[PDB]
Amino acid sequence: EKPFSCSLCPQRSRDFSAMTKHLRTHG
Numbered sequence: 001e002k003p004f005s006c007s008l009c010p011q012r013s014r015d016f017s018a019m020t021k022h023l024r025t026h027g
Ligand SMILES: [Zn+2]
Pocket: 006, 007, 008, 009, 022, 023, 026
């Protein structure tokens, strides 16, 4: 299995904390 990548977008986060902002920052 690979790290934790997002659903729609070529990016990855190390902790849900940052992965969350990514969603609130999606657009
Ligand atoms: Zn995303």
